[model samples]
Target: HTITVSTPIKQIFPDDAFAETIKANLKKKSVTDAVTQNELNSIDQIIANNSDIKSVQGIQYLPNVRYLALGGNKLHDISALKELTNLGWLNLSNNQLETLPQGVFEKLTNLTTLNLSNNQLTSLPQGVFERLASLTTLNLSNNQLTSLPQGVFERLTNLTTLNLSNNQLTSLPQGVFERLTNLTTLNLSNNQLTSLPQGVFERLTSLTTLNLSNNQLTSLPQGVFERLTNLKTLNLSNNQL
Candidate 1:
C-alpha cells in the first residue's frame, strides 16, 4: 500500500524557493501521474480479512500508511497507532472498543477525518480530541453516549462536520459546541433527546445542514432553529408525538 501525501506542499514549504524545488522534482511526471500516486498512497492500510482480530493491544507504528479500516474486528485497544503520524483517515467502527485513551490522537496531528461509530463508548474522555487540531470530519454515531461532556469538542476548532446520530443521548452539555464555530453539518437523528438545550444550535452559526430525525423529540425548543440562518437542510422525520 502507498502513503497518501494529503498534506499540501504549501503547508510544508516556507517560501517560493522551497515550493519551486519540490515542484521541479514533480515536473518530471504528469499531473495525472502525481494524482494517481497520491490516491494509491492514500489507501495505505486495509483490514479486509473475515477472521476477527482480537485486539490491537501492542502493535505500534504504521508510519507509511494513511488510511486504516479496522471495522468488524474485536479490537479493544488501539494505543499502538499513536505513532502513525501521517494518518489522515481512520475507521474503527463496528468494533468492541469501549474506551479510548485521552489524547490518543495527539501524535497523529495530520489526521483530518476519523470514524468511531458503532462502539460502546459511553462518553468522550476529557481532551480526547485535543490533539486532533486539524480534524475536519468526525463520526460518533451508533454509540452508547448519553451526552457530550462539556468542552468535549471545544478544541476541535477546525471541525466542519460531525455526526452524533443513533446514540443514547438525551441532551447536550452546556456550551458543548460553543467553540465549533466552523461546523457546517451536524447530525443528531435517532437519539433519545426530548428537547435541545436553549442556544445549543445558536452558537453553530455556520451550520448549513442539520438532522433531527428519528428521535423522541416532540417539539423544537424555542429559537432552536432560529439562529441557524445558514441552514439549508433540516430533517425532522420519524419523531414521536
Candidate 2:
C-alpha cells in the first residue's frame, strides 16, 4: 500500500516542500524509503511549521492525524484539510490565505481547537463554521477582516474562547454571539469598531472577560451588562466610552 509521490494522472503532492516534510516525518519514525499507507495512517500528529509549504495537497492521505501545526508556511490553499476528519487541533496561522474554500470544514466534526490568525483573510463566508459544533477554541485575530457574515459562528455553541482581535472590523453583525452561551473570553480589541449593536452581549451570560479596548466606541447600548452577571473583567480602555 505504498503511496505515489507524483504521477501524471494526479500528483499525490504538488509541493516539493510538503512532500519532503512528509517523507522526512515517515523516515524519522521507521527509517523507510517508501511511503506506505499503514505508516501514514499510523501517524497521529505532524508538526511541519516554518517549512515554506505552499500547498497542502498530500496531507489528505493521513486520515488519522489529530494534531497538525502548519503555521509559518506559505499556504494559500487548504481545501485538502477537510479530509482529515479526525483532526481535533489545527494551527494554520501566519500563512498567505486570503479566503477559505466553502464547505472546507464540513467533515471536521471532531475538531475542538482551530487557529486561523495572522493570515490575509478579509472576510468569511456565512455558515462556514456551522459544522464545527464540537469546537471550543477559535482564533481569527491578526487578519484583514472588515466584517463577519451573519451566523458564521452560530453553530459553535460549545465554544469557550474566541479571538477576533487585531483586525479591521468596524462593526459586528447583531446576534453574532447569541449561540455562544458557553463562551468565557471574547477578544475584540485593536479594531476599528465604532459602535456595538443593542443586545450584542445579551446572550453572552457566561462571559468572564471581554476586551473591547482600542476602538471607536463612545457609549454603551443601555444595560448591556445586565445579563452578564458572571462578568468579572472588562477592558474598555483607549475607547471613547
Candidate 3:
C-alpha cells in the first residue's frame, strides 16, 4: 500500500505579475506552484522595487513580514498593508498613491521608518500616524499635499525626523507640533506658507535642525524660536523675511 501527504495550496496573489515576483524571490519554479503556510512563513522581507506591480492584494498573507519595500511601482491602493502589523520598515515611495485609507497604519505599531515621498498624494488620513508610536523617521515631501490635518503627528512622540517640503501648504494648525517633544529635524521649505503661528515650535526643545526656506513668510512670530535652545541649523533663506 502507498500513501501520499499534501498540504493545502493557497492562491494568495490575485495578480499573476505580483505572484511571479514573490515566487521568484522565494526561488520557486513556477507561479502555479503550491504556497503553503510554511512557505509564506519563510518570507521575512520583500524587496520588490521597480517591479511594476500595480496591485498588492495578496501580500496580506505574510503578516510576519518585517521589512517591505515596493518603491517605484504603480500602486495606488495599499490597503493590504493593514495586516502587516509586524513591519518595522516600510517604503511605498515614488508610487501613485493619492489618499491613504483610514486605519491603514493603525496596527503598524512597530514601524520605525516609513517613506511615502515622491508620490502623488494630496492629503493624509486624519490621525493616520496616531498608532505609529515607535516611528522615528517619516518622509512626506515631494508630493502634492495642500494641507495637513490638525494634530496629525500628535501621537508620534518618538519621531525624530520629518520632511514636509515642496508642497502646496498655505497654513498650519497652531498646536500641530505641540506634542512632538522629541522631534529633532523638521523640514518645511519650498511651500507657500505666508506666516507661522506663534509658539509653533515652543515644545520642540529637542529640535536641532529646522529648514523653512523658499516660503513667502514676511515675518516670524515673536518667541517662535525662543524655546528651540538646542537648534543648531536654522535655514530661513529664500523667504520674504
Residues 131-202, candidate 1, lDDT per residue (tens digit)?
Answer: 898899999999899878788888899999999998989887768888899999999999988877788887
lDDT of 1 at 221: 69
Span of 10 residues, lowest total lDDT, candidate 2: 1-10
Total residue pair clashes for candidate 1: 3
User: What TM-score should be assigned to candidate 3?
Assistant: 0.93
Cα lDDT for residue 197, candidate 3? 95
lDDT of 1: 0.74
Instruction: Return the candidate ranking by lDDT, descending.
Output: 3, 2, 1
Better candidate by TM-score, 1 or 3: 3
lDDT to native, each model: 0.74, 0.87, 0.87
Specify the highest-TM-score model's number.
Answer: 3
TM-score for candidate 1, residues paired by index: 0.76
Off by over 4 Å in 2: 1-11, 28-32
lDDT accuracy of residue 146 in candidate 2? 93
TM-scores of all candidate predictions against the true structure:
0.76, 0.92, 0.93
